[PDB]
Subunit: 251 residues, 2 copies
């Protein structure tokens, strides 16, 4: 593994994929419970037109068995060979499907880094500053990039607060700060876009990923090129529909 990054165009290059340039990149998630499910999903998505494959490890039943995780990461990499693999255990605290102690979470991410099978890991901003700094360093030592994330599945913080969280991620060494918030009003969607523009403008020296969740916030999944979000998620609105709109907006 070896990735690049530049503060000129504010990009991160993982594989041949330049995150931060051109149209936003599409991330799809594997949410299988067993290795059978994970393999069936990866094969099914192999033909889809997406850019980054995220493995949602919190959906994996054998997450506490080290060899099972390594086995599943290898299985995915065998099927999807030409795309960055992002390893993401979403914590219970931030909406994930299973609970792990801080120690288990950090060791899980360390094992993923050590495997050499994953290009990027997702680390949560509020895990703990000492733990985050240590793990970002460890990932970087092994040429693995870090998407640092934060979520609010029930409300949208003030724009100022969103910007300061994205800034903190940058200060903790995130290669790509990422935040997802839930709108309660239409104005909240615009608040998330405002924060995106303000961060991109005032502080960003690398790509950022932002999203306003739910049908109400779908705009935020399409307008990343103008507003400054480098990636968006879709499932196989759909991945096909997402690429269609992104291509039109790039023209």
């Amino acid at each position: 593994n070896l990735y690049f990054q530049s503060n000129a165009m504010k990009t991160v290059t993982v594989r041949d994929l330049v995150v931060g340039e051109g149209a936003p990149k599409i991330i799809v998630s594997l949410m299988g419970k067993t290795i059978t499910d994970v393999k069936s999903e990866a094969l099914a998505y192999r033909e889809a037109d997406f850019d980054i494959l995220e493995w949602r490890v919190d959906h994996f039943a054998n997450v506490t068995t080290a060899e099972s995780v390594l086995e599943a990461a290898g299985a995915i990499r065998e099927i999807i060979t030409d795309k960055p693999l992002l390893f993401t255990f979403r914590s219970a605290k931030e909406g994930g499907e299973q609970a792990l102690t801080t120690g288990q979470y950090i060791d899980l991410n360390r094992a993923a880094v050590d495997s050499g099978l994953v290009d990027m890991i997702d680390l949560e901003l509020f895990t703990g500053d000492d733990e985050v700094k240590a793990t970002v360093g460890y990932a970087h030592q092994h040429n693995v990039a870090v998407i640092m994330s934060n979520h609010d599945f029930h409300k949208t913080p003030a724009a100022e607060e969103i910007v300061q969280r994205l800034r903190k991620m940058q200060e903790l060494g995130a290669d790509i700060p990422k935040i997802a918030v839930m709108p309660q009003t239409k104005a909240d969607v615009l608040t998330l876009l405002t924060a995106t523009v303000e961060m991109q403008e005032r502080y960003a020296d690398r790509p950022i990923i932002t999203m306003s969740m739910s049908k109400t916030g779908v705009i935020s999944r399409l307008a990343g090129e103008v507003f400054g979000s480098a990636a968006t998620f879709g499932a196989v609105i759909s991945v096909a529909d997402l690429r269609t709109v992104l291509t039109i907006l790039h023209q």
Copy 2:
């Protein structure tokens, strides 16, 4: 010669098209110089997928000859028989290709109303209140709906100023208030969307049409369903204003955002 409107559904229904319900409607502008050009443009437009046909009369060379304007309107109506026809002279003050005195502009719009060939007229917010109220009344008496419009081609006013202009249009009797503004920054695009949401949620009792122009504001032409703009402009071959994308691409995106 009869349109409907519902204050509660915030809709205006013209020639079976329900503006303000479902996905935003697509408006295309016909911009020919001579009657020959108008006829051939109407035929080319028949091949496209749009909801409302706007005739940009300020592009027509013989606008000062009443007979010529009526002939052109009739030629369009003969080709586009099932879609609403919107009559729009964009004033010189607000970017128009030619200038008319206020009195000439008012008489032009009254003649369009009288013709029975157009379903809607566009009147500019800053034309002159007393004459706009009189013309709105005249249009309504002949069952012609009024889109009232305002443009700022060099900047984006504050959100509250955009809202106030839209409210003033409603006050003047506009069936559909319309505003187009030019962003200088990315934040200006968001300002226009904020004004759209605030107007639609708090003060509107009818459909509104809003847009942030240029490539930078194109998202405002796509996200009307969520934010509250009832229609959007697309280009058949050439844009009538900066930021319009193809009608085909516009419908593709609107359909995706509808579900």
